[PDB]
């Protein structure tokens, strides 16, 4: 379908390598979001504790 030259093979290898970098970068983004999620869930516990006692 796409034009079969050696240049197009290099463009496809380049975008495969960019998507394989993107999997790593977005997993790292998910890791930072999970880090602040577990930083906030215990604040939710402490907020519910203070809310019920007051």
């Amino acid at each position: 379908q796409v034009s079969p030259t050696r240049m197009n093979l290099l463009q496809r290898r380049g975008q495969l390598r960019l998507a394989q970098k993107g999997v790593d970068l977005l997993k790292k983004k998910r890791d930072a979001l999970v880090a602040e999620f577990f930083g906030l869930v215990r604040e939710a516990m402490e907020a519910r504790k203070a809310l019920d006692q007051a």
Partner: protein, 104 residues
């Protein structure tokens, strides 16, 4: 800033100087919540946990955008004697939120 457990607690909220209500049934509470989203009490509502845990059906009913009326479960005056669910409530929060079940 409506809060719905009883009208008896809600006149205590008037004794705090904010508007509150009481319905003792689900559809009545969502209907008064619906007109409260329609004309605002500045869009910050808590409903009794034994009345409605998740009133978000009203959010997808009227105002799907901006999530401005924030809806909160709240421990009632006949229920705050026990300290409702806190740790298993966070268990089901994690189970609802991230998919996984954790212990931590």
């Amino acid at each position: 800033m409506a809060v719905i457990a009883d009208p008896e607690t809600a006149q205590g909220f008037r004794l705090a100087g904010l508007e509150g209500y009481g319905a003792s049934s689900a559809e009545e509470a969502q209907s008064l919540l619906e007109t409260l989203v329609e004309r605002g009490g500045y869009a910050l509502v808590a409903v009794d946990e034994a009345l409605l845990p998740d009133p978000e059906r009203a959010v997808e009913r009227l105002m799907r955008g901006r999530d401005l009326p924030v809806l909160l479960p709240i421990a009632g005056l006949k229920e705050a004697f026990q300290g409702h669910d806190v740790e298993g409530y966070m268990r089901e929060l994690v189970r609802k939120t991230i998919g996984f079940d954790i212990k931590l």
